[PDB]
Amino acid sequence: GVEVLEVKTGDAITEVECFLNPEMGDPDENLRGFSLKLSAENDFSSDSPERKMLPCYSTARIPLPNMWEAVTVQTEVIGITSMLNLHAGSQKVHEHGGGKPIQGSNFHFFAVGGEPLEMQGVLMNYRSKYPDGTITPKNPTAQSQVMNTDHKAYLDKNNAYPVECWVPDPSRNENARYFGTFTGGENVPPVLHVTNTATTVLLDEQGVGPLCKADSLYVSAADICGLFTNSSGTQQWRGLARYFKIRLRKRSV
Amino acid sequence: LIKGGVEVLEVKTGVDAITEVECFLNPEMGDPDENLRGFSLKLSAENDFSSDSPERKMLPCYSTARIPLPNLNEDLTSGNLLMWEAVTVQTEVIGITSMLNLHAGSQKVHEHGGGKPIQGSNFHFFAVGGEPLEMQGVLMNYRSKYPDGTITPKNPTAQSQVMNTDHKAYLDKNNAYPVECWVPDPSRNENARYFGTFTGGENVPPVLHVTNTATTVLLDEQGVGPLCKADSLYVSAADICGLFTNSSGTQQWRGLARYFKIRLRKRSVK
Amino acid sequence: LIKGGVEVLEVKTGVDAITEVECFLNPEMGDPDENLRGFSLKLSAENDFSSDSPERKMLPCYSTARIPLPNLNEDLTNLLMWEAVTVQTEVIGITSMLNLHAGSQKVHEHGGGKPIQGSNFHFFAVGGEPLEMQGVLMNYRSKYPDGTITPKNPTAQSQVMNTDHKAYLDKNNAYPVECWVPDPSRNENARYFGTFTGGENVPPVLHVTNTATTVLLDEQGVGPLCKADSLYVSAADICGLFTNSSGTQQWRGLARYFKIRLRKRSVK
Amino acid sequence: LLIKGGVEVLEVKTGVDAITEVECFLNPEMGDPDENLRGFSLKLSAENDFSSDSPERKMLPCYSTARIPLPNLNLLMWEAVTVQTEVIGITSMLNLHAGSQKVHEHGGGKPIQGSNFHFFAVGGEPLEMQGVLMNYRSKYPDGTITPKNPTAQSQVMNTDHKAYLDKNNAYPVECWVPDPSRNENARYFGTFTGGENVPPVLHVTNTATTVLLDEQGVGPLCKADSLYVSAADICGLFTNSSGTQQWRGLARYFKIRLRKRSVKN
Amino acid sequence: LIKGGVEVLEVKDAITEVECFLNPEMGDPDENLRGFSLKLSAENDFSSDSPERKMLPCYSTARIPLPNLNEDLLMWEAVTVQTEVIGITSMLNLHAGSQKVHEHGGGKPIQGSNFHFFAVGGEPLEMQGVLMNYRSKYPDGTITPKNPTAQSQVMNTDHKAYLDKNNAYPVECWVPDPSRNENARYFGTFTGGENVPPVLHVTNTATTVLLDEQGVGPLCKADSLYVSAADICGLFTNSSGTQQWRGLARYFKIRLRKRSVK
């Protein structure tokens, strides 16, 4: 919300990094990174999901040295090879076979901003009764199933904003860059790439990156990798942490 | 250099020569009742081609909106006319994560499993133009009897199942032009840019990307964007995301809104 | 610099040195009756290779059209030919496959109809002369029906490459797609593009946009040169199989639009 | 200073007759189990124990190769600069009436689908291959050339298994790959896609050229005025009405442009 | 300009090339089944998950000695790599051992979850541990996250390791650490699912440049280059229905140049 002047040159650069843990629901102390098992077939009139079943967006505020302009990010999902454990817990694919890989709907999303991520609410079912401890669209209507401009939120709390209720708001986020891919379907294969050679440039069309208000950088993520199928046939979301390395420079304003 | 039936001259320059407009365009999937905004009526199947009378609320339609822009041409005898020229669009489908609700209404994938994701045939389409989108009609079945309140190819013939050049329409009404009957007309739309992808099949995964970093340039090969006739910008969309499968096995289309942010500049015309 | 049996000289410039033509080319899927334009006859299956006699209406064919261009060389006192420089093309009516209420087998009890899916072939060509084809057969012993033009005097080698099987795409609804491909050993005066995707459950994936242009110039900057002021467009757009409530399957095809920009080229 | 094909590379020669083009096709070598089934393999056996795996020759697709003689020529050598290549006859797979198992009652025949391999090379000498086996104990049939004295290490990398692709219809595709530790005087390209239900995806166009020049601008140099083309185009499996499966292959077209290159003797 | 704990000066007989074929480490359950794992167990409770060593694919690594430079400072700088997976066509053997797809049909292709990964560095690859199940009891001869907690199922920064031993670091326990590896370049793709088709490309025309944004490649400490790989191609399904991982070797050709350092 400021007039942007010249990049400062000469201690004018800094780098910050974070590993941001996923918030899949964490149904007990041993099942960190998983959701509660999924319910199915609730009538739209009686759809009361349990909090531990709902993955939420992750976010962290990173303090910076006492404006900082975010210029690049390196990011990837951490622990993708853990899905090669087919011996623990997963339903056998057939008699004498190995366990079923994690697969199905997934969502991979990150943002880097100079302020909290701005979100827009959209619901599958406006009549869903969301559980205490979630932050979901207030006073939803049938219009909330399409676009209801009342549903604006800041991603200002961890393990609170359910991924199923909120998307990054393309009508705001003037001071953030976000990227997400949703792939839906029962049998969707997880496809995840890692490399330390790929950098995303955060500069806009005028060469200006996110400007860090109150010397704070905000990282946001959601990395729902797919569904884990237990021997019983029950399914749980599995998520993984996301790494960020952000390069910043001093910008005169 | 002729476009939008005017002679195109130079881009106008100076501080106030740019404007930006935005809108969220709601999907028109059929909206069978107040609870199922964003969905179609459940899908029928196996109608003989000779007795195919789909209900209106089962038929997704193209969405469109006319966005009024400032008049630029007060000075009638200056000799200089200006029109708004659309230069870029940022667009994405809104609410894609809503499909991660597998607890409400969807058939379980197997005993003790979660609900079935939305999947299957999908169509993602948008246009930005200086006039209504120009459409060409093509039917699966020329003998389909389309319901009151839809606008569909008039007096279709067997040729309407392939290319019948009689079926020209303007996308000039919301919740009227069924997506299954109409496509953007590549023989027209000289003053609009359109983009669509159809992916057909029972098990097709929805794949949707969001980012505020991606801009589509709307300039043609001569560097001219859509020119806004009557100081109007037209946005058009269809975002059928796939089929929702209820516990009963019934299927309904699910659609989502589309966001547009369009940057325009002043263009001199004769 | 030789192309289209002429020595290629300079590109001409000026307002009259460019022209544009357009065509919607209808598909030729077999058209088994007057109501099923754009479909084939239902598919037979399991014919022994020794007794494989497909019906004509079951066989999609390549489409082609000859487009007259503005007449050149109407003075006897320097030769010009039209040179095709760009094409815009797309398949027309792709959203018609969102009709899941008419005719198609339900996906499951209480469900909607089965989408068109399965093997597909999307192909076009732009040339200064008819498309040159090479014959290749699944089964050299296939007995093709009257009204089709198929490889003559085939042998087992016709299942791989038999150089006898050369044809021009010189007749509509005649050259079955399953028998012929564009000939990579010829077509020195045409540009062709095709993608075959085979399989029972292949999803049709089709894109439309008026922003995409294909350049038709070769490595020497020469486009197809239009013999006798004629441009040839060719297509095949088999979108997949339509499955009827009975389980019978029929090909579905769609028309292809072409918009071709040409310029005048001096030749000797 | 610039060394390739065991010669010092000097300047490209230009002018009248300093360029030539060769165009050819390679027929596929899928096994050809009888006179009528050119382009197919014998039906596939299944479930042989690794200790008793003796595939029949007609069941094994092999690499195709040919030596193309060039116009006879400080020495001059032909330098391969570009190749245009594509698979010939891809639309033949739209015949779903002949021989293939119906997909369901009253349905059409099952498309060819499943594991496929599409490969070509252009070189100034035979393609250099490295052997790798699924099962080192496989007993390969007379008329095939397969890794000699294989060991369990032959299932991963056994550096003993070096061969030249020096005979057509002899080197089974399942036994051999292009050797990335050699082929300094060839360019090769291949894609393997494995799986029962893999869709064949094949593109044809006469507008796509592959440049064969390396990072120093030198193409394959044709030793003894010979150009070597190699291919394998296993398109997938054909499923007969009985459920038996056979590989189907198609020919590959090549158009190669060459120029004269000066080299030191 | 600091990398590999040296000040990087100018690029400088100044070039060398090394190559390696790095064998896969899939578990090798007997003398005949080199390149395969032991058959996969399934449905172990998270509280009683004790995988056998021969069932666990591990990362491969090799230290490649380079010409000695400072005998009387220069370091080798890795500039490019050519790499590919070796023996991909071996999966066209559908006659040996694999379950028939249906009566009278050929054998089932190798398919399912796969992981293709390589790295080139001037020092061992730096790894971060992440577990499906922190309570997994890993077998003797494996090196797995020490003192695991439920946080080990997400990100536990305690789990740092060097890829400093072959056939030891299970692929399922470790990933390249994006918070380290300042002196290496790594690339990997995981594709998960029962029916995933293996898709593998070979060509001698593809080179990966290993220079960073400042034009500096990995700098080879102690005149050593480290190559690392994992190439789990998918699952082989036996006639009985049992499944085994199949892996293949990876080839590397690396071009290096001399770099002045202080």
From Swiss-Prot, chain A:
Descriptive protein name: Major capsid protein VP1
Family to which this protein belongs: Belongs to the polyomaviruses coat protein VP1 family.
Source lineage: Viruses, Monodnaviria, Shotokuvirae, Cossaviricota, Papovaviricetes
Entry's localization field: Virion; Host nucleus
One Gene Ontology cellular component: host cell nucleus
Residues of the full protein shown: 32 to 296 of 362
Subunit structure comment from the entry: Homomultimer; disulfide-linked. The virus capsid is composed of 72 icosahedral units, each one composed of five disulfide-linked copies of VP1. Interacts with minor capsid proteins VP2 and VP3.
Organism: BK polyomavirus (BKPyV)
Notes on the domains: A DNA-binding domain overlapping a bipartite nuclear localization signal is present in the N-terminal region of the protein and is required for efficient virus formation.
GO annotation terms (biological process): caveolin-mediated endocytosis of virus by host cell; virion attachment to host cell
Domain of life, per lineage: Viruses
GO-annotated molecular function: structural molecule activity
Effect of E115D: In strain: MM
From Swiss-Prot, chain C:
GO biological process terms, semicolon-separated: caveolin-mediated endocytosis of virus by host cell; virion attachment to host cell
One CC-aspect GO term: host cell nucleus
Molecular function, one GO term: structural molecule activity
Family: Belongs to the polyomaviruses coat protein VP1 family.
Compartments it resides in: Virion; Host nucleus
Domain of life: Viruses
Keywords for this protein: Capsid protein, Caveolin-mediated endocytosis of virus by host, Disulfide bond, Host nucleus, Host-virus interaction, Late protein, Phosphoprotein, T=7 icosahedral capsid protein, Viral attachment to host cell, Viral penetration into host cytoplasm, Virion, Virus endocytosis by host, Virus entry into host cell
Record text about domains: A DNA-binding domain overlapping a bipartite nuclear localization signal is present in the N-terminal region of the protein and is required for efficient virus formation.
Primary residence: virion
Protein task: Forms an icosahedral capsid with a T=7 symmetry and a 50 nm diameter. The capsid is composed of 72 pentamers linked to each other by disulfide bonds and associated with VP2 or VP3 proteins. Interacts with gangliosides GT1b and GD1b containing terminal alpha(2-8)-linked sialic acids on the cell surface to provide virion attachment to target cell. This attachment induces virion internalization predominantly through caveolin-mediated endocytosis and traffics to the endoplasmic reticulum.
Stated consequence of mutating E129D: In strain: MM
Keyword flag Phosphoprotein: yes
Name this protein carries in UniProt: Major capsid protein VP1
Swiss-Prot record, chain D:
Effect of S138T: In strain: MM
Role played: Forms an icosahedral capsid with a T=7 symmetry and a 50 nm diameter. The capsid is composed of 72 pentamers linked to each other by disulfide bonds and associated with VP2 or VP3 proteins. Interacts with gangliosides GT1b and GD1b containing terminal alpha(2-8)-linked sialic acids on the cell surface to provide virion attachment to target cell. This attachment induces virion internalization predominantly through caveolin-mediated endocytosis and traffics to the endoplasmic reticulum.
GO molecular function: structural molecule activity
One GO term of the biological process aspect: caveolin-mediated endocytosis of virus by host cell
Main location: virion
Keywords, sorted A to Z: Capsid protein, Caveolin-mediated endocytosis of virus by host, Disulfide bond, Host nucleus, Host-virus interaction, Late protein, Phosphoprotein, T=7 icosahedral capsid protein, Viral attachment to host cell, Viral penetration into host cytoplasm, Virion, Virus endocytosis by host, Virus entry into host cell
Domain statement: A DNA-binding domain overlapping a bipartite nuclear localization signal is present in the N-terminal region of the protein and is required for efficient virus formation.
Location in the cell: Virion; Host nucleus
Entry similarity comment: Belongs to the polyomaviruses coat protein VP1 family.
Protein's UniProt name: Major capsid protein VP1
Subunit relationships: Homomultimer; disulfide-linked. The virus capsid is composed of 72 icosahedral units, each one composed of five disulfide-linked copies of VP1. Interacts with minor capsid proteins VP2 and VP3.
Region of the whole protein represented: 27 to 298 of 362
GO annotations of cellular component type: host cell nucleus; T=7 icosahedral viral capsid
